[model samples]
Target chain A: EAQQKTIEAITKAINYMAKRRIGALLTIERDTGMGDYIETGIPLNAKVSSELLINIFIPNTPLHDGAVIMKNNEIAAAACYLPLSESPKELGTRHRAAVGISEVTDSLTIIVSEETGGVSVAKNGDLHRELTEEALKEMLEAEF
Target chain B: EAQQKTIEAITKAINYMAKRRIGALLTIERDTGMGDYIETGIPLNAKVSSELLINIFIPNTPLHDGAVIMKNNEIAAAACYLPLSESPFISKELGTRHRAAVGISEVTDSLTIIVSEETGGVSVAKNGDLHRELTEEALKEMLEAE
Candidate 1:
């Protein structure tokens, strides 16, 4: 039930971000200990909520520009910088950061493109671009 | 003066880690930001010194068995686990810790140093090869090298 709710919340959040054209980066940890990567950002150590996540990605805020890293059940940090991807010439900073993280860590990165309102998921170095709501839900369920 | 002090202090600490039969793993960050790995351990941000490095590597200390990362001339963290080398050429005798030292060196252009507790051997790894059993002078040269 909790997992289902998380999926719904994420879906709603992504839809909102897509509509508002906000660039967002969300990284969910898996087996790898992201403690090192977590340090490159401003520490939050807060509970995860869609509303809070939205606020952090809002434009002009210090926290809006960098990545948001979630460790297990908690929000580990915000404004985290990630490595940029080398492929895809058209890939913006958000997509490049998402793919770059997926290649290095055993984590899933969700990127919301501000340019096209497209949502992409990156995992294990493979990127799923322009994901629909159903596809995003499936991806989250499979990962979780 | 600061460069000489840092060099001296690091050499002194390396010798201590070797002579006291304490295993130590240290990585010096270069262009790559190790901010991700540094968050995994206890943050010290302390100035480099033989005593502090030795204390951190003493058996039974929380950080004794994990990776110690140095960034910008200060000790960033202690007891962080680094990725292990997956190369087929890695010796079978190298334990988990030593393999980890090689792993970090292979992945990053950073300097990875390993002090063996069993043999008191100092192994410095960079640019893929493990320069084993370094003399104090040779180790100094390696550290000073570009």
Candidate 2:
């Protein structure tokens, strides 16, 4: 039930950002942490909130990197740098990073495509594109 | 308890392996499968036997560099390769092997045991924490609780 709320909050933020033509990258941690790969970012350690997420990814801000890490049901960090994917040649930085981190760890990553305002999820080295609100909720519910 | 019996079995094997001064890396899985990081080694998938462990860690065997993995109280795999630790300040003697054990434990909640080749010291890594020079009794306590 708590994770369902997180999914709702994240989907709400994604929809908000998509309407504003903003790009975002978010990683949801699981059994393992991506400690070695990602350069440490500002620690939020705050409860998940749609309003706060919008402000962070609102463009023209230092936290516009959109690499927010969620630990359990809370936001743990922001502005993190992820490794680029080498295998998928056509993927953009956000897409590549989403895949790269998931390839190495058990964590699931979400990306909002900047060009088309599409939502995607990367997990276990596979990327699922065009994630609708219902689809996103299903994914988060199954994983969390 | 049956868990006590399992712990005693593991302690006996660890001590026996250490007495012969054999270097071995053993990891007990907690959660998450490290499929990408570790390659497929010889599948033991057999009962956890002290004699088998001793034989596998014998010098110059094809499986000398074995990284034994256990799951649900069974030997799952042997001779698996693990990611090496990137931490800088590690000692020279505990180079690649110790770091590999640490690396595996860092990514999972697994408990890893490393028996030293030179000094016969027993070290354990669990939940990203490494404890060195563990006595036999201490090993039993940890294995029992885990």
Candidate 3:
């Protein structure tokens, strides 16, 4: 039930971000040691909430520039760095980072495009673009 | 410079509202007495700020449904009712209550800021003229002029 709750919160935040055209990259860690990832960001170690996600990703804020690492439904860190994918020449930095993290781990990465307001999911080195709310929820439920 | 501060605060609120596409109607009380207008909604008599305005207009909140009245740089009341304009020339794209924004401005020398929920557009109504789709800088300039 906790994972279900977390997925719900993430869906809510993604919907708000898409509606406002706020760009964001979020990674949900699963069975992966995200120590190196957390080291790159400021440690938050806070429970995840839709409101916090919205506030953190507001444009031009200090923590809005990079990826957010989530572990077990908690926000482990903010402004984290991730490896960039080499195959996708057209993807922006945010999307590249999302795919990069998925390439190395079994984690699920979500991207909200700032320019297009489209939602994408990266998992297991594969990318799913322009997912609707229902599709996003189903994917999250299956993965997380 | 109290009026200047008030304009600054209102501009900040409008910018956030527009960014989030939150629908809102705000009337700035000028030389005209707004007692009758204030009587239409809940009296707040609180200081104005971008945060406060954002909270008040959050979707599904009780006070989000009606207009907010500002007097002398403070929020006088929220959820207030304003007379809606009967003009047939108004755009169909605008929400119904936005006509209230123009209606109040037609009868009074006040400035009204409107943030559309549907389009996320910012507009200002003054002296019965509605200026549509103002940028953040344009909104600030308009408020400063008032």
Candidate 4:
């Protein structure tokens, strides 16, 4: 179920944050990025593994014009296409939905993930902390 | 002005979940609550804040009709009021916001202050993840990081 929603968030963030490239995909957590925050004692991208819905409000008619490609019980692959802006302060809601989506679910948003090099894809149900992109690719290639 | 927004967020969460409510997120940046998701650390109060924006949306006008209240600006309180469902599968989006706020804050110790956009959804973040629904007391305490 969580996996399904993550796919949706990934797709949505892609179009909204990056642009009509397909759909964003979140494959990591927030705190688990650095692998772990030694000072704060928090896993870098661990925020994504936390239990929270954390869905940002995106209008049916998004401020930048977007769409909910797939989202019923669990959001999966939301295809939203908009212009690419390094920083979209005006589209606050959209931005929130994009980055915020990645903050919770382990799903890695394609936009931030791509721009930030790539979101680490930690192993499911374990405190893996973080992972290298190569490892992420290997995992993604794994069959469900 | 900031206070008003706080009040508005809490009020929204209360009214939205007249029956059952869950968690809330509070953004704390500099001192207690602030910043969205610090690269180093996310935040502690990222989840576990309060709701106080339902009141604002209660007007049943543009806001209630469709407009959502949350914002990305820094704030104090945010909440999520999710009614109990028979088959509780995934956390509701509102519930997710609240929990995320608390969850994030719990991590980095950064403030994800909030304002309940609606009773069920209270959230705020330095990175522009504004939401509503929270109480003054809850908001202040979260700021302390205690």
Candidate 5:
């Protein structure tokens, strides 16, 4: 009964969000550093036609319990709080092991580039950038 | 007994949460122009650390129907989300596979940089910028000071 209700709520959000996202600008744009705007061209072929953004929310579902599945904001928060055992390089194997863990678990991993100081969000079996903090919170909350 | 407990717990947790989820967002910075960040890392650890890693709680669990395995409460939750896949090429590999670990570390206080000799690189990994052909040397350069 619980799963049924949760599934209903999750599905309802996903469908409704997708529908609302129609006509929302899904194309992510950014700066080229030279006073110019750059387009990433990731291509969003949502069921809609005019929306610029898509806000998906899935609640009360169990998808973060195994060594294999999807990651969410909770995982991100946990990682942010977790301490590294060894240096980033010293624990190379562990690093791959971590990715392997994410690969299977489908956890949403946020990485901070030591070189660029930029952040990336891992989701949809992929990695993306140029996202808003509010959006990040929503993604995490939707899954939480 | 511990191993048995782990296997059982992991099996249960993983089997419980499972699905194929997707998400995206936009970012902007004063120093830099508009930017993008995406993540797709999830648990698929090779060693299969433990099964009891399951934590049926808030941060440890997701609300979607996707499988999740062993996970720690802190930063090492990389292996419980999704796999690496192609995405919008904003900040080079921003929405791509390499973005996951860096993405996590960048946004949250947590860290998830890949240090693999094969995948991570022959050396330490570079966290700031996307490693086009991420190699050990490039990784080393990022982790270590020039």
Candidate 6:
């Protein structure tokens, strides 16, 4: 039930970001610890909500530049820098970072493109791009 | 975050039920599947809310006689019949409600909440163990600790 609620919140945020062309990255921590991976970020430890998730990624905001880390169903941190994946050169820094985090841990990362308003999900170094709302929900339900 | 919200709703409902001495059985599904275990009940498939939970257990209501099954942040069913535990070690004063709580826990990984109608006490059952007479804070701490 908690997982479903989380999936709903995440989908809601992703939909909002995609429509607005807002760039954002969110990584969900699973079995692996992300303490050392979080290079720099503000410690939030706040509850997950669609409005709060949207607010954090507002353009030109203090915590809108980097990735937000989720742990134990809460927003553990924001503006954190993650490892960069040396994938195809066509990919941007945000997609590379999402893939990079997935390569190291069992975490799931979501990317919202600023230029294209595209939605992508990365897990275990595999990225699925241009996901619809139903597709995203299906992916999250399987993973969560 | 979802778990915390669910805890808040459960606590709120428990507070209301305890104050009124309303009996309730709430079983929260965990890692184990509760599909086969849920014998009989009305399918709700509704969102979790304090008001809805309270309304389900109101005295003399059609859905007030049995356990409420929670799955995926929703009320999956109401008036569900769970297997009764056969253990003789339980207190004689305990009724079927408490037994059902312990019963479902013994077979599944669910967390069951019991509000006694007679004493207006709150208890939680998990991992085949029952913690009795808990305060609201204690209940929240226990739920969060898991």
The model with the greatest TM-score is: 3
* Superposed model 4: Cα runs more than 4 Å off: A1-49, A52-144, B19-146
Clashes of each: 3, 0, 0, 111, 130, 2
Better of 4 and 6 by lDDT: 6
- The TM-scores of chain A alone, one per candidate, are 0.93, 0.91, 0.96, 0.24, 0.30, 0.94
Question: What tier of docking accuracy does candidate 1 attain?
Answer: incorrect
lDDT per residue for candidate 6 within B1-146, as digits (tens), equals: 88887778878888989988989999989899999756487665655766557766866555678899998887787789987887675565977899999989999989999999988999898877888899888988877875
Tens digits of per-residue lDDT, candidate 5, B1-146, equal 44454334333332332211222110111222111221232222222222222222223223212222223221121223433333343244234334543443344332223222222231111223333444444433432331
Which sections of candidate 2 miss by over 4 Å? Answer: A1-144, B35-39
Full-model lDDT for every candidate? 0.77, 0.74, 0.81, 0.32, 0.27, 0.81
Off by over 4 Å in 3: B1-146
**Predicted candidate 2 versus true structure: per-residue lDDT over A25-128, tens digit per residue:** 98888878666533476554556666456655755455567488887776676778877777835567899889888888888888887888888999999999
lDDT of 3 at B85: 90
- Model 4: per-residue Cα lDDT over B10-74, one tens digit each: 44444344433323232334444222323222121221113213211232212222212132332
What is the C-alpha local distance difference test score of candidate 2?
Answer: 0.74
lDDT score at residue A74, model 1, on the 0-100 scale: 59
* Candidate closer to the true structure by TM-score (higher is better), 4 or 6: 6
The predicted structure with the larger lDDT, 4 or 5, is 4
Worst 10 residues of 4 chain A by lDDT: A42-51
What clash count does candidate 3 reach?
0
Give a tens-digit lDDT track for model 2, residues B1-146: 76665566578778987887879888888777765544566554545555445545656454556587877766666678887777664466665678888878778888899998888899998766678899888888788778
**Local error of candidate 4 at A140, Å?**
9.0
